[PDB]
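step 3/5: co-fold with adenosine-5'-triphosphate
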Amino acid sequence: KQEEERSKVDDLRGTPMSVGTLEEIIDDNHAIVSTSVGSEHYVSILSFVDKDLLEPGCSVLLNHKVHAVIGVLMDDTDPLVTVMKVEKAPQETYADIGGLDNQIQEIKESVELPLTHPEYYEEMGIKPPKGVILYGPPGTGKTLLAKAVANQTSATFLRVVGSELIQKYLGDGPKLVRELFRVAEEHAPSIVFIDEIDAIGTKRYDSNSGGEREIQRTMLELLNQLDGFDSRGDVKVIMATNRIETLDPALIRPGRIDRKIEFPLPDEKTKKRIFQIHTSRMTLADDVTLDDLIMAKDDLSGADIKAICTEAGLMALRERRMKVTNEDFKKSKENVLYKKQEGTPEGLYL
Amino acid sequence: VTPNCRVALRNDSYTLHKILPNKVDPLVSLMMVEKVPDSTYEMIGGLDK
Amino acid sequence: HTDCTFIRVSGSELVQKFIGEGARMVRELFVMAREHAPSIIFMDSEVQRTMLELLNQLDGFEATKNIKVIMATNRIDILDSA
Amino acid sequence: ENSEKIKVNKTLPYLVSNVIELLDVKCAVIKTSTRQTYFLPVIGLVDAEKLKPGDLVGVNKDSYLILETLPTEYDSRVKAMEVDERPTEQYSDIGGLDKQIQELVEAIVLPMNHKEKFENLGIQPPKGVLMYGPPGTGKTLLARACAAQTKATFLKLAGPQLVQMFIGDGAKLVRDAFALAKEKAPSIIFIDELDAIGT
Amino acid sequence: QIHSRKMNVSPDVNYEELARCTDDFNGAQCKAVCVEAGMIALRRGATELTHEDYMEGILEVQAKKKANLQYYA
Amino acid sequence: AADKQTLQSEQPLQVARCTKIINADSEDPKYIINVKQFAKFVVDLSDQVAPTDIEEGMRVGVDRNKYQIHIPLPPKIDPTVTYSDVGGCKEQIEKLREVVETPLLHPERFVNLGIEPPKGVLLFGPPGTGKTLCARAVANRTDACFIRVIGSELVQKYVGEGARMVRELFEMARTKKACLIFFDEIDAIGGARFDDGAGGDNEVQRTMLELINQLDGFDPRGNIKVLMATNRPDTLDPALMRPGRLDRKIEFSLPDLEGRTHIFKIHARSMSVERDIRFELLARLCPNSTGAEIRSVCTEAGMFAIRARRKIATEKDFLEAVNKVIKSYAKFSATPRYMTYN
Ligand SMILES: Nc1ncnc2c1ncn2[C@@H]1O[C@H](COP(=O)(O)OP(=O)(O)OP(=O)(O)O)[C@@H](O)[C@H]1O
Ligand SMILES: Nc1ncnc2c1ncn2[C@@H]1O[C@H](COP(=O)(O)OP(=O)(O)OP(=O)(O)O)[C@@H](O)[C@H]1O
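step 4/5: write tokens
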């Protein structure tokens, strides 16, 4: 039966089996096999697995003793495959409209609509945007928008931190670039997101060789693999920073990165929805006016709205009061915002 | 087989033999790098808000 | 006097060795703080990196809720303002 | 004896390694090509005068005896720096610097031929000549002219050939380049763009 | 002339005209003018070198070129 | 089990480790081999091989017990490799036409006038400009051959493997006629012999010397044309600034006004627009730009053609495309808002 011949192939397999990289097809079914250290006898292949699945120079299943080619490889999994491949569409498409409302449309019709409906480009002959940078003040919504398009997705979403690629072994970074874009290739049209790559410029590290000539090579592999060859087709890639100065302009140049999208701090019309929805789930003495908080602070982030709208509940619930007086918003905003440069030292502005 | 949990591997034929319940990183060297016990509140005096 | 819930790893001691050297994504500490879910983390270019992985975990993606990460320094706060 | 000693060289290829130093408390320190150290108080089948520290030697895998000296110490880049072609340039090409040809020959060519011209008078030979001017006036012409016309092993040297990112001493390429050239080129050495390193 | 020794040179060449109307050339530029006479003579596909092409090399794209006749009138 | 029985007869047959040759001794085979990592070796042969073809820079079969030489093979074999807009920047394809076209066509301009064929050009210019356009625009007229090599592909951890790829390339260029191998990032390839008694980055160096040998000198080019892309003629080699090698140095920065109108034609016909509009106003609006940026302008007018339902692109879609890209996309969205001039 097939269990007997299958067990015979299993007995061709000697239980310590190794994993080694091919170099070249030697066409007459005896091959020559590199290990990680490359001890390469003229070994043969177990001739029931398909030899013609693999290109030359691809990893296989081997033996220790005779080193004979036994089986086919499956994948490569690192601590990054767990993190690069996002498992679920996590959460938070939006809990509050009124965050930005401007570049929401821009990321929507720039990223979502060419992806979700790629038939407009037939009508007009337009290429899709390949690289878009999302950058500005810290904690604007950029990471939150990455989790938005992560949740409101249509693709195999990929989440990458830019500092994941930093190793001490030689070539290890570009190897994880190759596994990286292999992941970016072989699922479906996937949304790659890469964040905090403004912290790859003036950066020197401990677990490292010669610093100026290590990550130059890895980022060089990013420049070659990212938007050089290997036909983009439909592979969405979105990166994000906070600053711009350490950016090598060789990737900033078009072809590679197409759209550079800033982020302002929100205006008072959009503030009211963030103030309101951050207060949508709390007991509040509604006689107080949020418009003092909406008017007063001029360059708030939404974390300032968050911190005040939690902090006033820390001041009312500090004394077991379910609803919040206006002076708890006073101590709230004066507790959040510190070192208000108004008078004292110079205050030349008066 | 738990993913990324470590095992006791024999050197015999590399027979996958036992599974080791363990923590992975330097956890010992700095995982438990606390200052353990000390004293009480009485020697503070003033920053009570 | 919180009986389990304060594991002051002190987070800056050999700073060019306890941080990033061996523990790149210093999240080894975060695996400590999760698998010792009563804990409190304390601290005093790599600092920017590990800073960013702090911000990769503690920006709304958190298991035992907040732990208590604390840094302390003095006299001017002109560390990198991200 | 020598049947089994040919056998010791024959066992495997008898791992060519490096001598680190040599003491005489006759005694030598081996670094394998596996980068592993093995002191021996007994050298074996060669003489300590024949070798020196920093050599490629054949060592038994088993006895760890210094078996033979390799005839493969060829020295990368230098032995490639020795110009073996020797392109021709007679002095008909040098137009306008004929007095510099004369002081050139009196300075350089005659110390190669006749030191009795110097030391029957009994002082010294000359020591080093500087060529300078605009860079199209011709500084290669003395190199190829003295290469072909004066029958000696023309050796060349460039300026940026003394700067490698990887550091640790300036005494390997230099000292094994001239200590290289003490035998198979001890008459002609052309340094070029010395102003690129003379800072 | 050492550069134009092996090249096919028409006898309608006065080297003293050429090198006399040269000002401030090194032999890097003697070679540059002579090989650029080979290349300017090589553009139209002449059978040999021509004295005009030597004279054209004499002014290989006006050294630094530019030639704005603004302010010089 | 298609062939399981013979596999149980192949188990008494297992030999021949990888074992790249270093060099040889004299009068005798007496070869010398490093394996990969372990050590270096003064080897001897199994007697049933050919002692001729154990030449240097090769890997033979080698036993495990005696390390005796079994048969070699060349390592790197068969899998290596996979223009109406001829005319962009103007005077570049004329000099390219000279140095490339004239040895491929006439040894009448050269030998009858008494010169050597100009065989290479050092291309220098900013990226995103058309080195790809010019070099692949050569491939219209040779026959149809073009090979594309990035220098940074050769960053490996094996001695002379880049130089082994120099062997592979200079033994593939001679197989076919009128072929084009492209060179790029030639600063990491090296022109200056950086060296100090430490011995680090030298696969670059020996690969560069193998590049000198197989490039020019030692069987001249013929029907092989190779250009070199750089930003700098600075870190080069005087052995390759040997003037029979690379003597033209074609220059290019930007199109003037009307090359930009030509690229307006190129990226205009390549998309759905309206044919009732002009582009010289846009070439006025583009002082300093690449044609890739022109393509970004045309796709941005495509974006306004997405917003409104447009397939015949008006002038104003391009007007807001340029006012987007050059003005509302220079740094932020405000380079103007002061009159003071008009
Ligand atoms: N409805 C809203 N309108 C405007 N801004 C908002 C709104 N909701 C949240 N924000 C802001 O956007 C940010 C969302 O989290 P974000 O990912 O920006 O934090 P972060 O991780 O610090 O970002 P970064 O790492 O880029 O600095 C919050 O800091 C908040 O201030
Ligand atoms: N002078 C030009 N004429 C026509 N199109 C041009 C011109 N300059 C730029 N382009 C356009 O911009 C693109 C620039 O990309 P290209 O294919 O040349 O790669 P590249 O980056 O320019 O090559 P390289 O960076 O090694 O010079 C061209 O493909 C073309 O669409």
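step 5/5: annotate
Residues F 85, 88-89, 127-133, 184, 229, 255, 259, 263, 266, 290-292, 295 surround adenosine-5'-triphosphate (ligand 2) (CB under 6 Å).
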